[PDB]
Point group: D2
Amino acid sequence: NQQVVSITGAGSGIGLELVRSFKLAGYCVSALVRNEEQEALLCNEFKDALEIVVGDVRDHATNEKLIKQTIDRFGHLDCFIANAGIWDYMLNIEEPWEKISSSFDEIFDINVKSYFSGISAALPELKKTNGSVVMTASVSSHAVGGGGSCYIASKHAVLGMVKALAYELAPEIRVNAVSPGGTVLTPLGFAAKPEDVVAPYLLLASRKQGKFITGTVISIDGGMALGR
Amino acid sequence: GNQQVVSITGAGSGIGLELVRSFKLAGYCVSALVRNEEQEALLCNEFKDALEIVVGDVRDHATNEKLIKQTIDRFGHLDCFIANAGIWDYMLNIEEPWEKISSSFDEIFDINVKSYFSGISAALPELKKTNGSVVMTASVSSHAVGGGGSCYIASKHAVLGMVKALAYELAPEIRVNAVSPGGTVLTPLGFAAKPEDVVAPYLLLASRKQGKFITGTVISIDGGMALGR
Amino acid sequence: NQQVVSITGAGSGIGLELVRSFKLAGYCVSALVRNEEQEALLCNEFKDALEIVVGDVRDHATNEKLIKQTIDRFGHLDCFIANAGIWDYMLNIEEPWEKISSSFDEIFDINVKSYFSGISAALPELKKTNGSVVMTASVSSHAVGGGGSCYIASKHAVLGMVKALAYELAPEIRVNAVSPGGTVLTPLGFAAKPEDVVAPYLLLASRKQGKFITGTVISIDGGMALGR
Amino acid sequence: GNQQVVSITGAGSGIGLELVRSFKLAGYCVSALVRNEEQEALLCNEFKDALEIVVGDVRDHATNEKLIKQTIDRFGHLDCFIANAGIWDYMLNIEEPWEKISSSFDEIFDINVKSYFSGISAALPELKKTNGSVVMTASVSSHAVGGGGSCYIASKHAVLGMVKALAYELAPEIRVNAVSPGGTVLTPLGFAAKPEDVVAPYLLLASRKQGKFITGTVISIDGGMALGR
């Protein structure tokens, strides 16, 4: 019953808090970080207990490497958490197409194609454990206001991933998402720290508590998806 | 303050009974509204007198007030109200004679919708003192068709409406959320879940730690049923 | 191919504009109005060309009477448009339960149970023409801001009606809805007059143009369902 | 001013060709972007030289600029831009070798999403002068599963995202909406629709009279397919 999770976007923000939270909950954890300074940050805390890969989620071999080192260290993979993401800083549709086009390629490369890449790399091992995927979506998957059109459209595509993959991969593999927002002015009156938004990830990964949850997006946004 | 207190309608059967067992196991003081004396005896055989139990009909406002009043007197405050008592419509067709439709509609909306309003009205002053939360039981019928007739599906969509309107209205003080279970006691995940399997979202949504940033949210737990067959 | 429509809530607002619009488009029209002054208002314009019933949608016999007089005058019924509705004037959940309870009963009696009543009364004739239903929903069926909790919940229930009835009654009868809002400050910068929101009703009723539309809600709200 | 002008991508086949025929019949001046010369000849055999036609690939930004530029030179202004060119993924499975997934993904998102951005970028300055509208072709795959693989469904969900973000961003000047067709050439309505059957929502959404109050909206026209089987 020893469970193993692999987390992209793990070197900062919600991803770093997920590493802490799944470690605290008993999981073995591997982590994909952008750079060596983030790797040292995890090493100062967990010493050698993690498998850490330093690389770019946009490279598929980096994703294959993360799974390969996970299985080689811990033997199997139970949950893959696709989380690395990037903002568009409210890029307006009026801008020069040269800027729109390059920003689109990066936003969609990281926020959407990387998830396909990470899940393709993780799938053969998730089938042997009948494991699960948890993707990071956004308030921008549901409402306008928190990004430009490129970002909001990339976060909607992730919602389509959840429903399509959950359906294709059931009954064997559960696929879900978490839609955080307003973190680090909401109806709840505060911005949350990344530590406050981790619990939905743990429920959706849990083999006991989430055994019957697939196709589901859990919003955790202070009510931003509602009104302002 | 540490000690948390939760009050649960529809608590003598199905999901509601498992919410009692689950919240008691997590350390809550639990009060519970139950339909009859047999269900009361079920809860006493297991928990003796640790619970506060009211027997009666959730469609009666005074009963909801009684549930709250006993909760406060027995436990002092109220942190979470779970409105969960529900009724089905057994796939009532719209072709049926209006006399039957009219009766079922009154029973479905009184129980699945109006009595959610009544429970929340009765719980509000105490939830404001603790800045607590509400969790409503919605349904897979809140999102997709197939699992009921049109009365049931319309009532479960109305619950989605309450979740959004009340969460907006009561913020920042009170959080309001819902759980949409489905296919309980054939899904894409290949099995029907026991009520014991679907309680974790309620615990998350009531927890002041894990759920402090969640309002207006609806957590589906349906084995993929909303996705389709 | 002569088409016949029956409209509730026809004496004012969108309902009155639907009477004008379907008449202008060639339909025979019957209309349910609240009172005799509204009936005179329609008579001043259309003289005796309509079947007008004066009554309360909450009474089922009034709904049966509207269909009965429609068939007796025009022979058949092609489209039923459930439109009568009522607001809650932002009734807060904090109010005395006595006020909440009575307001709920009226809001749900008119906005939801009346639609079931009108459709039950209209169904046997819609089956013979394989006709259609068009319900009036609201921006409040999708977003908060335009009503109290009772109203917003009643308008969500109508969305559930559309999906349930469309599914139960297909292939024979199409069931759809229109969600108007901000009529008589939106992102489009103006409030619309009821005349501006009628075209979706005509498309969903049209036997040629809407032959393939069922289960559908058409928002016409100046973008209110978006942001503010 | 009376005379309206519409520009349509994906115009040589399927729904796009029927949009040409439908808008021409409603009285518009029509320009059209088409994939090859055979489809150009199809449009000329029917309309002679009344149309402005550009042959080329919607994934190339300069082609979109060319479409607009010819529209203005031939007709003076532009009232509506319909981004409609699409491609399927033939139920590509996520188990397939990544080389294949990576290729399909690039082709699907370039055509179904990126080139919508490109067309709208090219049309914007002219739509602002007329305070015109945009209509995008979404899909039943924007709402439900079943009608594609995960790439296709994700791209069609991204279009829903564009509709909401652009309508919010461009208001009050420019309206932005979408049509979600499905099951074209088994549905709850019992038949598959010809492309000729699904054009009315586009006409409504482009009309400055009938659609002046519609933005951020998506009109499903799918025979009930989103409801389920």
